[PDB]
Subunit: 262 residues, 6 copies
């Protein structure tokens, strides 16, 4: 049967829950996960890239801040088509990786965070602030954030709150240079997230001024899961990362094996 | 909503209107425009290449000859879908570029010609089976658009029953390929893209200037001799080599400067 | 008109019928064929690779063993759409290539076998979850086509109910994958492609020769022993490694010669 | 006149003194600095790589921890030969880069640009010889030190190798010790030694480099109370890095492609 | 016996004497000459690049203007060591290449032009104007010119002319943004050239103003081989090219075979 | 202290003593050994390449035929300088690699042969001027070391006055190149490396087997027929193509596995 042309961009929010796990997590990512991934999808993924997270900002834990990276794929077909489940060579993926990322607890005793994998169209749906910004305008602190309203919250209500209450604070903040948003494609993989936003600042101080201090003006919604914006349960209903404009890890173009420092 | 699979090849005819602008324009192209472009379309353009123009031949001005290059994209989706208007980072584009290319005067300019085509030539009119072993080609790519008021079917018939036979009859001409421009994509005023190969510039001139003198001047002619169309407005062209080193998705490594 | 999005993987079984032809065939493949091919399909083939065959195993001749390589393409559109027949530059193709590969005798031919598949295996029949860390594979890729007049459903039933269970039972076999050939694309006489992994040639022989002796000879058999099909006409194969250096769209840098 | 074949590895310790500068510094490094650099030295530098620093560990400030990266060059000739001063195209280098790296204080003390030349091969292998990549991920702590003015270099060397290295050797958390003398003849670098000291992770680093080092006596020349006893960023610099970098610039750079 | 470490940069001035030869010449260079060359010297040449010439400027013929390109190598050893004469595979080199480049004259296809292959140190020896210029300062029209004084002229006399009379005009011209020079290594291959200069302008009009109009003030030297500057026999005693800052033909890095346009 | 500029080409002759070891050995070479090696010497090795051997020809066993590959390095400094013994990361090297290559039994062990040479052949003894346009070569690279007690000058004279003339006389032999091994580097037992080109395996056999029967057996002979030297201990060889896809500093992109 036919395969549907379904061009999409996806984002995975990859945390590292202790600095002691960072070397092992990073090794697995770059030594094992890259080649396993390229091996599988080279023919129908046009871009596969990692954007390391900037250092977690103050109060970033409240925004489900991914301490390792954003992982980005651009697909030509849906990875969730059941026909794609069959692979000659499966990826090497031990449960330790889930520990390092905080999806499971480290050691048996006798609180895990979900794997958030959000599919989007390849083009942002809403260009809300900063249209026409070029790279010549300077370095961006790009805060990418995904949010999913809690169970029982009417999605249209949440949408209206986001666009009529939250975004206007971003608009008013001269520190914020760009606001972009897309609806998550929920029909692909059942992701609990509803929106992905990207909100740019000059720097971490700008991010804090706007996302912590200016947001104190919002009323706390009745559905709030924490006392302050984003009012959503960290890592479950909100995830985020701040990233640079450029990554060296444009993996289909730039990977040459796991060469080690002398 | 869905995005339509629309594989296409497009050509842009990039002029340079003064030799004094060449270094500036070339810098912008290779230093600024390449990375902005790749950044935007890497996920849905499978090839992005520049073919620098050979030196403008004698009378080339009358064919809307692009003195810089042909820019070539191979798209998997239509770049003119309105959803594709949104971009996180927009291209760095000094208005001087439009002066360099002749779109606006320094103080009528020539239009920006961006023609979409199917990926495969629609008509193979001379030289089927030619291989690269057959030798180096002087490849003359030309796009034409009939003036307002000219019936497109009339124009087509003229092109294929009067112009193409002169190409076919010339031993100097080794290949003739043609496609209709996909007018539905972006409103391009061109109607056809032809590619016409010669051994060399002398061959090009022999056929495109001397042999074409036998044509009758059409009633809609905008200039006295073939192509009978307003240079840069209703005809644009470039002569290029078989190979370019600027296969930009594969070969670009940053703007490295000479020592 | 539109072009259909048709993601496919194809395999070509490339033999070398005499060791004396190896240097010449290998030169054409790597010096001439690669650049001609990339030139034609770069915009719509996302992967183009050669997997050189391991040395022919004992009795491998009975399996139509390709003594040069498997050639693998990943297509976004069907290469057999008649619009794709037109090419600016055709491939340089000496008729001797056909002699080297055995399609024509040098002064009975074997057919050129070019099988199109979906990009993902349709059937995972042994070894699901095997990773590269589990060790090196001897990957025996085999394509079969039942003879004229054999009901395709009865061949399929034999394959999956008689042959595959022997593979499933053998500890020497670590993986069994299978897909139906897309016969609508190019009229390929093959019906299935299977890939069957072993640790090594000895394992392959134990299973594909010794264990298969237990099969009853089908009424339609074209040879006495499994695969019961005419070598190179109704069965072709190769054993290959997990990795190839010849991932051509990514890795090719011209025909650089040893010093 | 002839040019001397002088194969060397150099290290530059690149700080980032405020998180607010990180985007600008990183952009300049990757967008501006890489192509300028490759333009100049492609014909006589065989490797040019950046190793981004892991997050600064607790007390890392006392070690002159480079919060951006280590910059690594492998040279075939000396960059300090006076003939190499002439270049067709000079680097684009705005003053602000010096603020972002902390060489100039923002409008309390500036820190020096530390650029240490070494032989390409480590001179001393003091622990963990034979370790392979199969043995696991390393937290590689690279540290350069330079004894204060007035301290006899041989006395400093004796202290380093007779007092400090034994503590590293005693710790099972330390898996590797390597050292080379700095080639001070090349560019007058104040540093005297570069060591690389491997751990499994930041907690192992801390246990050894902070807790175990408490056993050392404070030298009479100490510039701070605890090990390394040297003035941060002036007489000691360091970074913890991974085994692998994607920024192997002569092989891997394809221009400054921006996220969509 | 030992091989001497001899880092050098060399330049070859490649002409195309008729436009009708351009497709053939360009094809041989990129389809045949690149792979033959890389095959031979990959282990001891660290950079191999072509800089295509800008369009020949008015009166450029008088400067021995190379209408195809400059070919540039960076060597670690001297290519003229006799031990390097032996090669497993020799280059494919039709005599027609010599016709296309002008080494064999049209007269039977009066005088051919020599193959000029100048070895230099890797670093310019003299920085005569524009020290400190960066790429941010703007696009350069880089006029690279080599000169060799006629037989009979004392090299010190020629050097004195060059510095007393020519260099001051270059330095004084506001249109000239950079002047660099090196002495040709005369001990490598017998090259008849004595100097390589590179002289930058904004554009061809600036090149003309200085190299044609400002040079009209010069007295004709007793040894002149033509009536106006450079006073040297085009293509025999002077060769040149105007080139851009950047080339896509950085062959050791960027070459992927002779891929043809569709 | 200074490091000496010492440009050299080295060759390692890599055997695979059983076909059952081929997948394992090949995997270690390409998955493990490439990255460890590039990691160590990227800054001072300008080329690192593998030339897979053509199928072992008849009687190739008597020439110490390397059934896996030639491994070729171009060095800027001597790898045997004692300062180069120190490495941050040592190569991952399972003892089984010694078994696969035949240095130890799972038969007498065979030594690791690592011959250093100048980067340029010292002697050009037939075929000077041959280009790649002349056609595909079957390149037989052979290294020999005279047995203990044989005067090296005597061996040299026999090589160049008795053996090489037979190669030169044969129309089947198109090229003969030789260099003396740099024995001061690593104490290699080999004395000479020769490369001897043919059109194909049949030509190789005609010359190296049949034509060589005319030689008198030397008094120091270790086997009855040419090469008269102990296979794998005093002679090693491989036949290889002009081109390899395994030009490892340029072409390696990690161990990507077939789908
Ligand atoms: Cl919930
Ligand atoms: Cl509110
Ligand atoms: Cl709370
Ligand atoms: Cl009109
Ligand atoms: Cl007419
Ligand atoms: Cl049949
Ligand atoms: Cl049927
Ligand atoms: Cl049965
Ligand atoms: Cl039979
Ligand atoms: Cl001090
Ligand atoms: Cl102490
Ligand atoms: Cl001409
Ligand atoms: Cl003269
Ligand atoms: Cl004068
Ligand atoms: Cl004159
Ligand atoms: Cl012996
Ligand atoms: Cl004899
Ligand atoms: Cl014997």
């Amino acid at each position: 049967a036919d395969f549907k042309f379904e061009p999409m961009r996806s984002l995975i929010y990859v945390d590292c829950v202790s600095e002691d796990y960072r070397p092992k997590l990073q090794r697995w990512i770059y030594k094992v996960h890259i080649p396993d991934s390229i091996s599988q999808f080279e023919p129908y993924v046009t871009k596969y890239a990692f954007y390391p997270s900037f250092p977690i900002p103050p109060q970033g834990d409240r925004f489900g801040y991914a301490r390792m990276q954003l992982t980005e794929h651009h697909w030509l077909v849906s990875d969730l088509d059941p026909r794609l489940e069959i692979k000659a060579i499966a990826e090497t993926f031990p449960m330790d990786v889930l520990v390092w990322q905080g999806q499971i607890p480290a050691a048996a005793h006798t609180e895990g965070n979900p794997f958030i994998f959000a599919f989007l169209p390849m083009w942002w749906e809403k260009d809300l602030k900063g249209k026409g910004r070029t790279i010549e305008d300077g370095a961006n602190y790009r805060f990418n954030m995904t949010i999913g309203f809690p169970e029982g919250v009417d999605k249209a209500e949440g949408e209206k709150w986001l666009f009529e209450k939250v975004v206007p604070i971003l608009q008013a903040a001269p520190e914020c240079t760009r606001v972009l948003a897309s609806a998550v494609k929920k029909d692909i993989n059942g992701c609990v997230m509803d929106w992905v936003l990207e909100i740019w600042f000059e720097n971490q101080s700008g991010w804090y001024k706007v996302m912590v201090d200016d947001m104190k003006a919002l009323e706390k919604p009745s559905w709030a899961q924490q006392d302050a914006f984003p009012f959503l349960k960290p890592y479950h209903n909100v995830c985020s990362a701040a990233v640079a404009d450029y990554t060296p890890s444009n993996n289909l173009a730039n990977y040459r094996g796991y060469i080690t420092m002398r």
